Design a protein around this ligand. Structure first.
Ligand SMILES: [Mg+2]
Ligand SMILES: [Mg+2]
Ligand SMILES: [Mg+2]
Ligand SMILES: [Mg+2]
Ligand SMILES: [Mg+2]
Ligand SMILES: [Mg+2]
Ligand SMILES: [Mg+2]
Ligand SMILES: [Mg+2]
Ligand SMILES: [Mg+2]
Ligand SMILES: [Mg+2]
Ligand SMILES: [Mg+2]
Ligand SMILES: [Mg+2]
Ligand SMILES: [Mg+2]
Ligand SMILES: [Mg+2]
Ligand SMILES: [Mg+2]
Ligand SMILES: [Mg+2]
Ligand SMILES: [Mg+2]
Ligand SMILES: [Mg+2]
Ligand SMILES: [Mg+2]
Ligand SMILES: [Mg+2]
Ligand SMILES: [Mg+2]
Ligand SMILES: [Mg+2]
Ligand SMILES: [Mg+2]
Ligand SMILES: [Mg+2]
Ligand SMILES: [Mg+2]
Ligand SMILES: [Mg+2]
Ligand SMILES: [Mg+2]
Ligand SMILES: [Mg+2]
Ligand SMILES: [Mg+2]
Ligand SMILES: [Mg+2]
Ligand SMILES: [Mg+2]
Ligand SMILES: [Mg+2]
Ligand SMILES: [Mg+2]
Ligand SMILES: [Mg+2]
Ligand SMILES: [Mg+2]
Ligand SMILES: [Mg+2]
Ligand SMILES: [Mg+2]
Ligand SMILES: [Mg+2]
Ligand SMILES: [Mg+2]
Ligand SMILES: [Mg+2]
Ligand SMILES: [Mg+2]
Ligand SMILES: [Mg+2]
Ligand SMILES: [Mg+2]
Ligand SMILES: [Mg+2]
Ligand SMILES: [Mg+2]
Ligand SMILES: [Mg+2]
Ligand SMILES: [Mg+2]
Ligand SMILES: [Mg+2]
Ligand SMILES: [Mg+2]
Ligand SMILES: [Mg+2]
Ligand SMILES: [Mg+2]
Ligand SMILES: [Mg+2]
Ligand SMILES: [Mg+2]
Ligand SMILES: [Zn+2]
Lengths: 206, 18, 60, 23, 83
RNA sequence: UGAAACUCAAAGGAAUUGACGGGGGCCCGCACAAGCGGUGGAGCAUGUGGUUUAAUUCGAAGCAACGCGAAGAACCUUACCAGGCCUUGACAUGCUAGGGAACCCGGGUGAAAGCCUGGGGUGCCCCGCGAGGGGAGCCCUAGCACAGGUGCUGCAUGGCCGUCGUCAGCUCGUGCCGUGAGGUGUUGGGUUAAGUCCCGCAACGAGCGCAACCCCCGCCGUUAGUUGCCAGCGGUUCGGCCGGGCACUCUAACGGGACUGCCCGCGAAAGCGGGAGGAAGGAGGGGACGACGUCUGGUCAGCAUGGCCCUUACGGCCUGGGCGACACACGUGCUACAAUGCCCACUACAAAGCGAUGCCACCCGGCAACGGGGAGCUAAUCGCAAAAAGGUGGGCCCAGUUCGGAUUGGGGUCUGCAACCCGACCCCAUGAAGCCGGAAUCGCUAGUAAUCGCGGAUCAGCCAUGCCGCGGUGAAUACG
């Protein structure tokens, strides 16, 4: 086991944090807890919408959560009435005025977190794990991506002897910092144990 | 015949009690 | 001995000296950083996601 | 030597002060 | 050792058990878990059953064992050698 | 000449990819050599084996386990042991029933936990000049669904990490070769730190790697000028202190600068030797970055997670004990054995960090650890702070010593509910082994090794001599 997380490797160069705020030594952590707590709520509730990235912005006693969901209609609800039921339920733990934006997804087949979640879904749904890899990587490249790689690990097909299966198209320069590589992870639960789904999309260099 | 290692002679179980 | 010790560290104790940190993410008793309220592992996990304001893999 | 608490040397080592190394 | 600016330590619940006994014409056999308690001159001539983690070791108390904690007289490791 | 009983599920031929060779060739790495300091002996610190124990919780196992998980075990931690206790439970949601509570002050007992307990007084929308009965944050007694499990399987798993190895390699698409595995390309000449690049070629391209983009350090510019700086004039209790000023130093963002660009020489080319300008030259020093894979490598005890298992107990609370045991054995370290040294006084020069139940100036008490007072600092301002080796001066005179500071007696300080097991520190006294370490054995190629001190994470305190950093001083040697 060797390889560095490609997003933590690009923080400051190609990648921005999921939380933007200064806070001092005396209350940084307490903001971090809410931050982690917030995302829990929304990954727990807005998973069905195709959640991709929870950006959390803070100025002072007013917090600015920003969801990046594939189908935002599943978030807003009856014309702002689902968004409301959580724009409120957020303040129920927030304590601050929890201003909640929903942002469109440019192309879901270009959001590594989603590709993962969808392959993870398919293998949770008893499809051929080898097929799903070669299919996801196909869909990504059709979408103009300059390279894409998917990786499955665990008891594929419930085979006792765990295994690792992957497939890759285009190019994925992991050692390059100027390469924009969306990386997401999904976790696939089954009756026989757990499998890990890793998705790498080369979006292009800068 | 209880929790962890060493074993108490029953399969799987050890000597430590709660 | 996990969950009942997650709770117990929260409880305010019979004595000041019995206070101790735990990771608020995973429950770890050891290697808990005060600044984050996090063990050294969860620290490295949340960091690499960029879910930690301003934190960046140092180098020099 | 550094193991000698009773010298200016041993207090520099154990990072303490006293008669044998005041401040 | 304990800062003499502060007290001389006895859990206050073992001391009470003694003074009472002193009053009514002692001695009952005193059992307690306060190994950290000091041997105090009021105790001399009682016998305090001290806990060694497993048993209450019975300890007679004489004028010359007064500066000490009671735990000093009920050891906790049973060793008896190698061989 | 030439059988059989009996017995096996193979015995074989060629060729393929590997791996291996006390086969070959060509390369390389503190691999050896050349050197410099150490380990192996001593005493002690810590980890481990073994043993012991009521328990000495559990894991890591050659390199790559052994100051490793442990970036802080007196209680807590704690997963172990003894004993005293709880049973929808310390925690989650949800269904009832009876109180109808919410929450803050008590008390009897007991080591505490617990068991028994005693006070006051709740809105919510209501029919209210009413008796007041509902309903409802959320509490409680019983009853359920369920919680709980650091119990097992790392040989069912995800994730993360170790490692070979920053080694130069691993492949693919189409074409070609072969019945086929497979081959070619990736081999060959030259080159490079490099499957780096050149030339050659039944191959032509392409991907993962190498390099590059990122960070620190080295020179210069711009932009800034307080809390930082003081070149030159004005004051000055002589402190950049005040006037002023941002030149410089610095601080922290944005740039420039090195590319074999130029000259000579070799060469088919790539490059290679040397030269000049230049702060810096052949990748300028250092870091971050770790290929396809390997090892049924490590982790079910961080977490996640399938299956197995426990249910007044393999769960949970408590007090005490243990994790600190000691005929022994190993590992990683600290301090030394002394004069290129030790000691006292005096006096210089860092860098990086930390600091509002914190850092503590300074002042008095105390031989001191400390205590009491007590300014400033939300900190380029105030503090931790003194750096230490160094330099000056004095003392020791080759001695188990003015070397060494282990062990033990006594007397204190502080943190802490509490230092018996089992804390650190201070002062008096004590003053062990050790005279440079058997067989054997480790690290380092330059601001390196060696030597000197400083800081931080954890943290009440601390068993840190550990770890991660920081600058001071600054070598030896590499033929091959
Ligand atoms: Mg089943
Ligand atoms: Mg054992
Ligand atoms: Mg047995
Ligand atoms: Mg238990
Ligand atoms: Mg503690
Ligand atoms: Mg902690
Ligand atoms: Mg053959
Ligand atoms: Mg050598
Ligand atoms: Mg030695
Ligand atoms: Mg030794
Ligand atoms: Mg053992
Ligand atoms: Mg062990
Ligand atoms: Mg285990
Ligand atoms: Mg420690
Ligand atoms: Mg306990
Ligand atoms: Mg304990
Ligand atoms: Mg394994
Ligand atoms: Mg694994
Ligand atoms: Mg194992
Ligand atoms: Mg190879
Ligand atoms: Mg082909
Ligand atoms: Mg053919
Ligand atoms: Mg082929
Ligand atoms: Mg090859
Ligand atoms: Mg090859
Ligand atoms: Mg080949
Ligand atoms: Mg060949
Ligand atoms: Mg290389
Ligand atoms: Mg070729
Ligand atoms: Mg600098
Ligand atoms: Mg200027
Ligand atoms: Mg690289
Ligand atoms: Mg194994
Ligand atoms: Mg687990
Ligand atoms: Mg499991
Ligand atoms: Mg230990
Ligand atoms: Mg030895
Ligand atoms: Mg050590
Ligand atoms: Mg040693
Ligand atoms: Mg300090
Ligand atoms: Mg002597
Ligand atoms: Mg001798
Ligand atoms: Mg002497
Ligand atoms: Mg001396
Ligand atoms: Mg003493
Ligand atoms: Mg102690
Ligand atoms: Mg001598
Ligand atoms: Mg030597
Ligand atoms: Mg080298
Ligand atoms: Mg020295
Ligand atoms: Mg230190
Ligand atoms: Mg500390
Ligand atoms: Mg000790
Ligand atoms: Zn954690």
């Amino acid at each position: 086991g060797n390889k560095i997380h490609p997003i933590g490797f690009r923080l400051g160069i190609t990648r921005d944090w999921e939380s933007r705020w200064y806070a001092g030594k005396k209350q940084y952590r307490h903001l971090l807890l809410e931050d982690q707590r917030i995302r829990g709520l929304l990954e727990k509730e807005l998973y069905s919408a195709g959640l991709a990235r929870v950006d959390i912005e803070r100025a002072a006693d007013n917090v600015a959560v920003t969801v990046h969901v594939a189908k935002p209609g599943v978030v807003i609800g009856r014309g702002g009435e689902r968004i409301r039921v959580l724009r409120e339920e957020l303040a129920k733990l927030t304590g601050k005025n929890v201003a909640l934006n929903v942002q469109e997804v440019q192309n879901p087949n270009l959001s590594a977190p989603l590709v993962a979640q969808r392959v993870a879904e398919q293998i949770e749904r008893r499809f051929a794990v080898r097929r799903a890899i070669k299919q996801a990587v196909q869909r990504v490249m059709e979408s103009g991506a300059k390279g894409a790689k998917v990786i499955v690990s665990g008891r594929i097909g419930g085979a006792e002897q765990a295994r690792t299966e992957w497939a890759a198209q285009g190019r994925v320069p992991l050692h390059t910092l100027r390469a924009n590589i969306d990386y997401g992870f999904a976790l696939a639960r089954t009756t026989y144990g757990v499998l890990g789904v890793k998705a790498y999309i080369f979006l292009g260099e800068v | 015949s209880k929790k962890s290692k060493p074993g108490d002679g029953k399969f799987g179980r050890g000597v430590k009690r709660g | 001995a996990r969950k009942a010790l997650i709770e117990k560290a929260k409880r305010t104790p019979k004595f000041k000296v019995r206070a101790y940190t735990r990771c608020v993410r995973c429950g770890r008793a050891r290697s808990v950083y005060r600044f984050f309220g996090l063990c050294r592992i969860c620290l490295r996990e949340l960091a690499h996601k960029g879910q930690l304001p301003g934190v960046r893999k140092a180098s020099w | 030597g550094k193991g000698d608490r009773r010298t200016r040397r041993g207090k520099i080592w154990r990072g303490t002060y006293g008669k044998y190394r005041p401040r | 050792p304990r800062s003499l600016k502060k007290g001389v330590f006895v859990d206050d619940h073992l001391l009470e058990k003694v003074l009472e006994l002193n009053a009514k014409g002692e001695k009952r056999l005193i059992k307690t878990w306060s190994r950290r308690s000091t041997i105090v001159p009021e105790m001399v001539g009682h016998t305090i059953a001290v806990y060694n983690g497993k048993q209450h070791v019975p300890v007679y108390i004489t004028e010359n064992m007064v500066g000490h904690k009671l735990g000093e007289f009920a050891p906790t490791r049973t060793y008896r050698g190698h061989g």
